[PDB]
Design a binder for this molecule. Sequence first.
Ligand SMILES: [Ca+2]
Ligand SMILES: [Ca+2]
Ligand SMILES: [Zn+2]
Ligand SMILES: [Zn+2]
Lengths: 7, 11, 11, 7, 368, 356, 356, 368
Amino acid sequence: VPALNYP
Amino acid sequence: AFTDVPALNYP
Amino acid sequence: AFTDVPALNYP
Amino acid sequence: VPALNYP
Amino acid sequence: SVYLDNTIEFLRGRVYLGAYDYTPEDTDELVFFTVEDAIFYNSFHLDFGPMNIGHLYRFAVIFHEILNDPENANKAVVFYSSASTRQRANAACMLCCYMILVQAWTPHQVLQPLAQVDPPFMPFRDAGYSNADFEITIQDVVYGVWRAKEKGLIDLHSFNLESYEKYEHVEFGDFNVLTPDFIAFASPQEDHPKGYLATKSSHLNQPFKSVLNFFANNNVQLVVRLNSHLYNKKHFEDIGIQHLDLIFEDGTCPDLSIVKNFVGAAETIIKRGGKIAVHCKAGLGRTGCLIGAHLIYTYGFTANECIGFLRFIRPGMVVGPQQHWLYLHQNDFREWKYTTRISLKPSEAIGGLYPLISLEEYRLQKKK
Amino acid sequence: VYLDNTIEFLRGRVYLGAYDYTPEDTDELVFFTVEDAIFYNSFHLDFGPMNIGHLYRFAVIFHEILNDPENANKAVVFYSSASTRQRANAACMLCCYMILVQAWTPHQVLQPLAQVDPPFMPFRDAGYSNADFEITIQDVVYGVWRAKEKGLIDLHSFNLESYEKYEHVEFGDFNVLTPDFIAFASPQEDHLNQPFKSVLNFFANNNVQLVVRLNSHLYNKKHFEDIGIQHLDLIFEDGTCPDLSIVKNFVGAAETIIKRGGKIAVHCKAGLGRTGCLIGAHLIYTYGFTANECIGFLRFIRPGMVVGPQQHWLYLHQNDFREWKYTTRISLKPSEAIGGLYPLISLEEYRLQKKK
Amino acid sequence: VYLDNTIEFLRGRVYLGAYDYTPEDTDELVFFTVEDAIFYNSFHLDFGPMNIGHLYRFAVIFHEILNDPENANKAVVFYSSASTRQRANAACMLCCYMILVQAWTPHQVLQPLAQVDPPFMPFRDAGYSNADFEITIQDVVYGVWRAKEKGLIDLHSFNLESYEKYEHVEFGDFNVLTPDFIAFASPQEDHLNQPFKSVLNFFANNNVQLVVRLNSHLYNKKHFEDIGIQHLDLIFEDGTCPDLSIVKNFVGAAETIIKRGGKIAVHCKAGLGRTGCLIGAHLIYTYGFTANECIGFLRFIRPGMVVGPQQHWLYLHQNDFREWKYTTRISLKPSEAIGGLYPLISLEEYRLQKKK
Amino acid sequence: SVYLDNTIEFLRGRVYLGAYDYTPEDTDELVFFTVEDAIFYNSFHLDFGPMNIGHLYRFAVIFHEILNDPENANKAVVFYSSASTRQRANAACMLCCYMILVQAWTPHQVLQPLAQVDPPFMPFRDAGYSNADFEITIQDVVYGVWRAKEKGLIDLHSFNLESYEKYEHVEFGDFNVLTPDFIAFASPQEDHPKGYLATKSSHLNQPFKSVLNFFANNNVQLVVRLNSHLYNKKHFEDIGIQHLDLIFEDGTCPDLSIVKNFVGAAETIIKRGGKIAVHCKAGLGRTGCLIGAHLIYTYGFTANECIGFLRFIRPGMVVGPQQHWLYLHQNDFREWKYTTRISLKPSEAIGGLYPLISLEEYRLQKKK
Ligand SMILES: [Ca+2]
Ligand SMILES: [Ca+2]
Ligand SMILES: [Zn+2]
Ligand SMILES: [Zn+2]
């Protein structure tokens, strides 16, 4: 799972 | 509100 | 192409 | 006249 | 009409809704009119609609004077606007509010002609400076205005356009009568002297005197302040009106303990037959949270319906994060009708007034 | 940096486009679309949104492009055609991905999509009459997010193979919506055909303890009782709205089975319209869904539920569904109307049983 | 870098946008629009393009923002509303600026505007009947560029004050199109009113040696002959197309005055329709304009010229206009049909005069 | 129809042009049909249209079989497509070409219903890999197809769809009969041996033999090669066809001296009643420059009309900078009809054939 968390 | 409301009711 | 060309000419 | 010539 | 493009049929042969980037010409069977140049929306920032109740009334008299013109006896009237999605939403929403409030149509009857239209209408956004992240639709506004009419909150026949436009101005108090029970206004400002001059009504400006005069002649019993002190509260207490402070930061969301105290403070004033006047700095953001929560608590509005109804009377209410806050706490507002009840003992938090308590606290009082 | 009709979700990494042509890849850009592979099977004039099975297949393609070493320093652009209907299916499917995989919040995924021109086409029902009710992407996002918070959706436990298998008409045509409910179409009996045999085998191995029939008799209900499953009829006309007395009986019947730890299986003829009313009323009663959130969540699992006038019915009665949590309670005495299960009674009659 | 519905002309310096809202300025972006100040006066259903007077006022605002020291490292974005009609007026006005000021070529200004969605609204005529003929931005750009190459347009010599003054109906309502031709509306005589007196003063000080009347008599033609200007009638019905014999006579009459070094002043009642046919046929005859380029160039100087069926007439006869350069030549004998001027005869009759 | 949106009226009550993102349902007064799923356009790169003459013929038979269905006796037929601007241009342009070629309408009659439509149609672009910088409109194509019919270049009644689709394939020669005088094809390829095997027609592949067989039975007198040598020219000379090389670089524009020699080379072959076959690598770019210049020289096409007519028969002709080149030199092509004439002495540059000379050179020959 790529790290695409909200900034 | 009025005194001249047209009859625009849903058929 | 033809043999059944409808009459769609400009009025 | 600003220099806006095509590259 | 057959050759018309981008036109919606409401009443066949009578009412039509169009959208063109040109001025169409009238025929022997059609008549076109628009109100963009005279009935427009004032934007705080990037909000564009919907049109308020004062816009609908002015639209109704123009619509009626065209319907009953003998020259337009057998013609179909086409109300139109520009081709922009924003201006197509205000025109369609205002036409729906007309059939709701004047022709007694139901929401599913006015929402059918506007469903699955390409291109779709532009949803309404808030009046804040930040980027938009919450939208209400025409379906929300129509249901909100329709529910308010069913509960007796809106009666366009007793509506007075004269005072509605007068008291919305900044130099006259900047307020609107949302419901028969509530009034939303902006914080009055004054330069209170510290001498004998502070005993006469001479340093009070015109919008302050307009608020004091209107409140004294309209059964206003309580004033709730939500922002910092910009005036002296004694001017409201001299005319026999209670003043209460429930101050929290501008743009933020109120704690649920503040909301509960507000509901309890306003419910007894309603039980006494009076009105409550709530204000923050501008009377839009913080005022919309408390009044909107009481409306959901009372009449069961959805969060989207409640926002749409408030803006239909007073544009720009509920700003920014307060929209998602009202959306996520709407269940708690309606829950209080079944988990709480008015207490028999007054509370010092709302100035010797009766608050909300649980069903265990209430029955234990009536027994003892 | 020069594109048109492209929305930014993550700066220099995630983008949402819409073009009527195939864009070329670049040293800093890589484009991909699933319109040609992942599509929505329409009943009539409904076009979306994409279901959970479409979401899973989108995540596999998305993750493969993300971790492709050739795309190490590229920004990925997920695009579709320029139609307002296809732009809504892609935007909503990308939002549900960030909600269920990347743990975003509703206001975070809705910010890039707000006030865009042209706007997205709102979703409609799967009925034949003219549309008069619409749900938005904001409704579906909030519905999918709320369901995840209540533990109703877990993509880690999602089985794509069984989801697609049992959704087919040949395997029974059903979807398990929640850990408590299952919606299917009415089985048919002319031994037993494969769809009926597949339903009996699945219900026996998944703790199904109650089957509720909502349409006319098309089979023998003894086959469910032969394997130890209680059968119950709450039948009303197809396309109509259930009386509130039927809804109250359904809630109490389902709450009794939920207390025991079993599942309830509801069906009309297609398992969409009448089935969505009762199951939708219970979800609003239990977890406090809005009417629009509840419709969007059901269609995200099983497309086409709640049809026509049932949409306005669920909208005008959502307050009564959330009211029963505080005005009623499960009775201590069984009722013959729900086949021996315990119904709903108000607190006045309940506290009387407490001692008496 | 994040904008939508924005076209790039110069990387990081010039951009063309279209929004239904007012965008905010940034440290790297500055936005400006002229829709509220520079607009197109419409005759009926025509909306553009913008004329040369609108171009000049746009260049002053553009240059002021370009050399503003606060915008030293910003990219300028010229935008309009999202309507296809207003997006065409802005894009075409920005293209004509790069042609006449920055010395761009047609294929350079048309590249950013090609294959954009939604496309620009093509320009129509200023008549009352339904439109059946359209010119594009590609036509106007090529027409403005060709006119500049032939020395017909010079923005350095453009006088904005006199251009706006003499275009008004109170000052005579005329525009000098080329160094050889002037198009005006028919003067009216009930002393003499101001518009008639303004036309006589301008013609006497600008080397006007021939006035051609194309409509019914509304004044006394002696006022032009009193100051030494030849008057000529080539009248045909308003809204109709001139016979080719009238066009041939007009070309020979104008070529005679051009040889002497004077100017020709043509007018119908409004100086748009019938006037555009004859002057348009001469421009195609002399410089080889296409029919669409010629219409776009005339409307860029004087909006509304060539109306209705005259557009298709100029399109189907453009080959005959360019043919007269090789099949005819100015006659050595005057003709009574053009008031003593020399008409056009074929080479067969011309080489006979050469000796005889 | 009254309730229809985004629909254009051609023949009132009979013919309509719609555009919807859904499948409309037939009524007792309406019948809808589309041909997107069966009659589509093959793209070299980013070109999307217009539809060629083979697409029009297939559209005509479907249109006629719906018009004469007794079930659709009193209904209005609505030909529609998707809502994309590209697919709305191919549908509208093909419907206009139908009325031009079959119903004998004039351009201003078929262009009136399509004028000032919002949103506008997408203009057609070239078939090159570079960015587009040149567009032709439906007005250009309609005028181009109409002018070709007036000059006898197009006769849909003698049109044979069977051979049109057969000989456009790559494995059958890849050519089209543009006019009764010209043929555009792709360069034949072969592996010419250097022994006794080079005397039998056994190493020639199928598309080469198809070209040789078709040219020998259709009065082809001259073959003009514009690209490098990919085959041996003796195969065309053995069947009595002259071969001539006018080679210039692919994608570039031909010098006017090459264009003049081509016009002169083809004019005498036309004077002898034969056809000329021109080819580059693909027979689109370089072939379109020379054949297009001769068409403008002969019948007075505009540059835009000429490009639209060539692509209506053979899609993808005139690529990239060749579009602006044909546009800026169209005056020189029509000028040659009045400044030049066919010479009486042959020229070695066009293989002992008669070229163009000035009027001073020509009269000096007939005198002497
Ligand atoms: Ca766009
Ligand atoms: Ca439309
Ligand atoms: Zn004071
Ligand atoms: Zn060989």
